[PDB]
Nucleic acid binder design. Sequence first.
RNA 1: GCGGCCGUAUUGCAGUACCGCGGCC
Lengths: 95, 175
Amino acid sequence: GAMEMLPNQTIYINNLNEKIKKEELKKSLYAIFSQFGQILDIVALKTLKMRGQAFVIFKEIGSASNALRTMQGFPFYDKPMQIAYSKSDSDIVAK
Amino acid sequence: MVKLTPELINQSMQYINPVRERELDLRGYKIPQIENLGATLDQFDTIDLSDNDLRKLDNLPHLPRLKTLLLNNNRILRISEGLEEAVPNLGSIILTGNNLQELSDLEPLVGFTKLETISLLINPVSTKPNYREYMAYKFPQLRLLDFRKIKQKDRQAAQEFFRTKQGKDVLKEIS
RNA sequence: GCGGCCGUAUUGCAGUACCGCGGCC
Ligand SMILES: [Cl-]
């Protein structure tokens, strides 16, 4: 298997329902993940490469860890969320 | 324990959030009661009262700009009636992680004319019998419930159910 | 201009004008 990521403040979500308009997708991602902590930003595009995916950037690593553990497979707009730590640090958390 | 004060409001983060709206951050202060929100001067699209110790949703001043309420992880078990007079344009109410118990406890949300999104995840009421059906039937304008859409076919089926004797009995008991 | 329904392709690690295509009602 590939290398696992140590806990990061950013979670990567894919298998998202691609029919949902981008604005509404970000709005609903913000609402459902707001339970876990302060969210610094959400990065979601609907290009061919990046649609069906989103990065949710938390201020605290603990918030991301709970988000990942709790929401894994949650049926968001009737598709189960696939959630992982991101493979790189998000720009907005740069020192 | 804390009070929600004008100074607490003035010293909290007041910023453009990730969905481009004006948000007041009141998360994590162990606030026991809503008060003094009039001091916001109706500046915010969104108020984040996540992670406090509210036991009821009440005591709102007139805030026509307010469109999203984040109420994650409080202890809310009652909503005051008639809040649509204070916050008529409320479009989403996020009550994830609270203590609302019965379908009749949601009665106070009915008069919001623009309320298109509700989360009652991690509330006791979300596992009551007939929960999703009832919500479709009782809130005609509700579009997204616990981040699953209420489809027209869902609402048709609910309305057909509540016209049966079984459904009628369910409604009788909810009252 | 504004929707509804059905299907189909992409399962993709990013920082955004915008975002796949097709069939019915
Ligand atoms: Cl970023």
